[PDB]
Design an enzyme around this catalytic site. Sequence first.
Site, PDB file in Angstrom:
ATOM      1  N   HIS A 145       0.993  -1.242  -0.145  1.00  0.00           N
ATOM      2  CA  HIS A 145       0.275   0.019   0.056  1.00  0.00           C
ATOM      3  C   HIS A 145       1.092   1.314   0.138  1.00  0.00           C
ATOM      4  O   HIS A 145       0.440   2.308  -0.229  1.00  0.00           O
ATOM      5  CB  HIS A 145      -0.905   0.101   1.299  1.00  0.00           C
ATOM      6  CG  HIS A 145      -0.307   0.300   2.520  1.00  0.00           C
ATOM      7  ND1 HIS A 145      -0.235  -0.661   3.391  1.00  0.00           N
ATOM      8  CD2 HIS A 145       0.130   1.592   2.901  1.00  0.00           C
ATOM      9  CE1 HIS A 145      -0.074   0.154   4.528  1.00  0.00           C
ATOM     10  NE2 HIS A 145       0.356   1.386   4.449  1.00  0.00           N
ATOM     11  N   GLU A 177      18.941   7.294   8.796  1.00  0.00           N
ATOM     12  CA  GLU A 177      18.094   8.282   9.173  1.00  0.00           C
ATOM     13  C   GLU A 177      17.720   8.386  10.500  1.00  0.00           C
ATOM     14  O   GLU A 177      17.714   7.246  11.146  1.00  0.00           O
ATOM     15  CB  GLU A 177      16.704   8.493   8.440  1.00  0.00           C
ATOM     16  CG  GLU A 177      15.956   9.881   8.487  1.00  0.00           C
ATOM     17  CD  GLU A 177      16.641  10.878   8.343  1.00  0.00           C
ATOM     18  OE1 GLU A 177      17.494  11.545   8.949  1.00  0.00           O
ATOM     19  OE2 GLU A 177      16.641  11.435   6.934  1.00  0.00           O
ATOM     20  N   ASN A 182      16.822  11.871  12.519  1.00  0.00           N
ATOM     21  CA  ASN A 182      15.962  13.085  12.710  1.00  0.00           C
ATOM     22  C   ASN A 182      15.587  13.543  11.393  1.00  0.00           C
ATOM     23  O   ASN A 182      16.415  13.835  10.369  1.00  0.00           O
ATOM     24  CB  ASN A 182      16.947  14.160  13.383  1.00  0.00           C
ATOM     25  CG  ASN A 182      15.882  15.548  13.559  1.00  0.00           C
ATOM     26  OD1 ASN A 182      14.804  15.795  13.011  1.00  0.00           O
ATOM     27  ND2 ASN A 182      16.200  15.998  15.012  1.00  0.00           N
ATOM     28  N   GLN A 207      16.560  17.255  10.448  1.00  0.00           N
ATOM     29  CA  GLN A 207      18.200  17.666  10.579  1.00  0.00           C
ATOM     30  C   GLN A 207      19.113  16.836   9.824  1.00  0.00           C
ATOM     31  O   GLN A 207      18.678  15.473   9.957  1.00  0.00           O
ATOM     32  CB  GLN A 207      18.496  18.009  11.914  1.00  0.00           C
ATOM     33  CG  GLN A 207      19.959  17.775  12.237  1.00  0.00           C
ATOM     34  CD  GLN A 207      20.078  17.504  13.744  1.00  0.00           C
ATOM     35  OE1 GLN A 207      19.220  17.304  14.449  1.00  0.00           O
ATOM     36  NE2 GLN A 207      21.211  16.855  14.119  1.00  0.00           N
ATOM     37  N   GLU A 256      23.249   9.981   6.997  1.00  0.00           N
ATOM     38  CA  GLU A 256      22.447   9.552   5.896  1.00  0.00           C
ATOM     39  C   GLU A 256      22.762   9.226   4.501  1.00  0.00           C
ATOM     40  O   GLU A 256      23.650  10.130   4.286  1.00  0.00           O
ATOM     41  CB  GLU A 256      21.373  10.647   5.798  1.00  0.00           C
ATOM     42  CG  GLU A 256      20.696  11.013   7.057  1.00  0.00           C
ATOM     43  CD  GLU A 256      21.184  12.384   7.746  1.00  0.00           C
ATOM     44  OE1 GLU A 256      22.350  12.605   7.321  1.00  0.00           O
ATOM     45  OE2 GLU A 256      20.493  12.858   8.540  1.00  0.00           O
ATOM     46  N   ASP A 312       0.316  -7.894   1.948  1.00  0.00           N
ATOM     47  CA  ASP A 312       0.842  -6.550   1.929  1.00  0.00           C
ATOM     48  C   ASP A 312       2.136  -6.487   1.936  1.00  0.00           C
ATOM     49  O   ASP A 312       2.580  -6.092   3.075  1.00  0.00           O
ATOM     50  CB  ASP A 312       0.016  -5.616   2.882  1.00  0.00           C
ATOM     51  CG  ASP A 312       0.260  -4.094   3.101  1.00  0.00           C
ATOM     52  OD1 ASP A 312       0.754  -3.568   1.824  1.00  0.00           O
ATOM     53  OD2 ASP A 312      -0.331  -3.474   3.639  1.00  0.00           O
ATOM     54  N   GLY A 362       1.973   6.754   9.053  1.00  0.00           N
ATOM     55  CA  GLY A 362       3.373   7.136   8.599  1.00  0.00           C
ATOM     56  C   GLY A 362       4.383   5.855   9.057  1.00  0.00           C
ATOM     57  O   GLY A 362       5.558   5.965   8.916  1.00  0.00           O
ATOM     58  N   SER A 411       3.601   2.451   8.572  1.00  0.00           N
ATOM     59  CA  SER A 411       3.322   1.409   7.777  1.00  0.00           C
ATOM     60  C   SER A 411       4.589   1.068   6.896  1.00  0.00           C
ATOM     61  O   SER A 411       5.285   2.026   6.475  1.00  0.00           O
ATOM     62  CB  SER A 411       2.333   2.186   6.521  1.00  0.00           C
ATOM     63  OG  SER A 411       1.193   1.755   6.435  1.00  0.00           O
ATOM     64  N   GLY A 412       4.589  -0.230   6.682  1.00  0.00           N
ATOM     65  CA  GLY A 412       5.869  -0.541   5.841  1.00  0.00           C
ATOM     66  C   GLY A 412       7.153  -1.037   6.737  1.00  0.00           C
ATOM     67  O   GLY A 412       7.988  -1.511   5.997  1.00  0.00           O
TER      68      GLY A 412
END
Lengths: 240, 47
Positions: A45, A59, A61, A64, A69, A93, A186, A188-189
């Site tokens: 999805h 990642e 924050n 910032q 990253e 899913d 947010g 999800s996945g």
Amino acid sequence: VVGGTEAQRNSWPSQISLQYRSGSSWAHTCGGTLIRQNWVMTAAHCVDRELTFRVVVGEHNLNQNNGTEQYVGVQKIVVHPYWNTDDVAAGYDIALLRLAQSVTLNSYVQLGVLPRAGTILANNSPCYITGWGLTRTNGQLAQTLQQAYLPTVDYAICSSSSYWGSTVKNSMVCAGGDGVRSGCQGDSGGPLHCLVNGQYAVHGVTSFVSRLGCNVTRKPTVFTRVSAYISWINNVIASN
Amino acid sequence: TKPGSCPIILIRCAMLNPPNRCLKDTDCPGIKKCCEGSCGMACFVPQ
């Protein structure tokens, strides 16, 4: 994640931020797990839309530059063939993304460990959900990666009528439902990390929550049971 | 717009702004019901 704590900067090196190109800017949309230096595992999805995607590794924050990253474009999107865009309760899913390039592993960027095909966790296994999701029902996305302790609710229990009844399939995993801790929009996945015999592995892909709220007593967070797709995973990667 | 009711869906994908597959019942064939699904708006058979 509702009711969590900010995770230590190196606690979950496999956690990725899946982002879409939003005007000129990029928008955090979902979690994912780095499973190969050039592959990422997410929810169907999240990538079942015509958007331009990127992945961010190391990642911490979202607002910032931490300096840890790496930004990588998404080269291939492979959605489970049985996935129905409409029906998230039907299951399947799960999606795999081929990165435009291979990441550099370090203290902050590491591969996620998947379970042996068919592994089933007993009731109340110790798990942790991580993500940049709403920190409260209808709240705002977290800025820093959060984590919350969320133990398993075995199938027999999860599928009972006071829980999710017929909604939850044996191809899914439920964790939490204490009304205090949970995944939220947010998240999800992203992964569900479980400790089994002194080793952590990625057993879930955050899928869905209740319509009544994120943290709802006896409405655990539902994830796609990874252990059920190992052969699918194995063939996609081998051939893409 | 529509003669019947939409089904209640009690699960929500844990994603913000899920993609809509219709806006109006009219974006749906026959017993066209544009409704709130499990992950965005979709076409349901009414009630």
